[PDB]
Amino acid sequence: RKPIIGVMGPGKADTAENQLVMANELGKQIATHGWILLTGGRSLGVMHEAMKGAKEAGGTTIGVLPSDAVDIPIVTGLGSARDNINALSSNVLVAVGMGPGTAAEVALALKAKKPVVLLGTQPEAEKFFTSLDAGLVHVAADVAGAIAAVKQLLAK
Amino acid sequence: RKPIIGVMGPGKADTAENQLVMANELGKQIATHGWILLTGGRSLGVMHEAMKGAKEAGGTTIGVLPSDAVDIPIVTGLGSARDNINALSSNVLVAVGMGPGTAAEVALALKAKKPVVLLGTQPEAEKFFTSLDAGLVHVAADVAGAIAAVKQLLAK
Amino acid sequence: GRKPIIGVMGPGKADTAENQLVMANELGKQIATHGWILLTGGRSLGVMHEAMKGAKEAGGTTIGVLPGISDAVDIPIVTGLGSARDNINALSSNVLVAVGMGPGTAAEVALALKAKKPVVLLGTQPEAEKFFTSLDAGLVHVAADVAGAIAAVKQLLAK
Amino acid sequence: GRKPIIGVMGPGKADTAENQLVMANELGKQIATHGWILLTGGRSLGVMHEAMKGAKEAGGTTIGVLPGISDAVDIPIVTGLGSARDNINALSSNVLVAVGMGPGTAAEVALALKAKKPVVLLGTQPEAEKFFTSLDAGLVHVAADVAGAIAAVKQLLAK
């Protein structure tokens, strides 16, 4: 089975331009490394950019929702009070940027003892998540760092 | 995008031998028609047999859970009070046999105005579901009938 | 020393006959009069709203479950889950009573039986009664009227 | 004319300091004394159990949410959802108070902010206070003690 890498981040209103670029490049790299991308299938900031990037590099995408870039739409029927991407399906969860919904998904991943890679979250986030579980939180400085952390974690 | 056909039915204790055979043959046919099979990824009566059959015919399988035959495991983190297979992801839902959990999923599909094909449910079930929504309930006498109903519904 | 919680389910406005609205209101009255808590949908329309009005009139405590509200609801429980299911957190109830029948109701009754909880069917048609009884004969109680439903509930609680 | 519902969240047994247990009990007392309903987890261990004991001692009404129970719980709500989330149907609460902090608590606080509900942080460490305040400065109230928490809640309800 191919690894499944989850991607979470803010929506369109709350994603900065550099975060969009990071998300698009992360998605490309997920695809090139032979991994399946799991993210939100409706949301049009980080999650859509990640999807696009993965598809542009020929990878397989799972979009979770309550775009042509979505290969496998998974429709949860849980509505949207939570940005649920069925993230427990992922081997590793990557957050690009930060916001309330992203925070909740990162915290729940840590609850389930799953590793999280934080990319472009500012210092409070990094420090706060590290305080919850230092052993499971990986802070990435850039996309290449995030991919490298993912690679290591899959090797473990 | 390939069609996604959902399969629901009872677990190991409550699936009769002929239902197991039907489920395995349905899974084969789903695969041969170029469709993705969506079913429970833990449950070891109808749902496992469907999975096996699909894989034996070279098809792609999505297993939903709270086997090597599962290609894409989707882990919901919703526990098991409901036999949730994220069935709203399906174009058509097929029930093979009947039991409380299967009944709930068929009723919820009808709630969402999605077609359901009933295979090897006895008369009370057929009559009861038809009473809920006649236009959306398709009673199949055998696997070939169920596939044929699915084919028609995808053409619509 | 906890008060029993009786769940009530039924179809909404469009798919409910007036006899069902009246039965639901009376049922709500009797539930409260017996000192039981009513648990139902909190969204203000058919069977569930009538039950809620009935219980409040008789002085009972009401719990109304919403995904995302009448003054008849004492305690609004907001689940933040879909509208895809008529979820009323029914596993909380000691007994679930269905007044009439539709797809959402049917799902909840079936999930109650999956949980091995008893269900009382009031004003459902023969197909339903026969179908749910085939799912689990020991947990499905068919009631001919509100009195019969209340008696079924009371006996269940006494066990 | 509905009673306010105040939600309380915190970590379970293993990850709770005794000061937090004491704060939670006092908080529960004060919530009940103000005539408010306590909504918390119904599973009998750390902060949430202490809060529940406190509210019951002061005569308040308690709602304890479980996936699948102390005599201190008046109304057990059983969600039939995972243990993957410490779901207490918190969207039901007018204000959510966190006493201490761990991953489940953090998720619920973050989801409250996503819903634009106010949150009171009591006995959380600076990292948390600073992080949640960066998420939404207008909805996050940092409380230095139980009195401060209660005053924050009371002011919020008065608005």
TrEMBL record, chains A, B:
Its domain of life reads: Eukaryota
Q: Which Pfam families match?
A: LDcluster4
| Matching PANTHER family | CYTOKININ RIBOSIDE 5'-MONOPHOSPHATE PHOSPHORIBOHYDROLASE, LYSINE DECARBOXYLASE-LIKE PROTEIN
Protein name as annotated:
Molybdenum cofactor carrier protein
User: What is the originating organism of this protein?
Assistant: Chlamydomonas reinhardtii
- The gene name on file is MCP
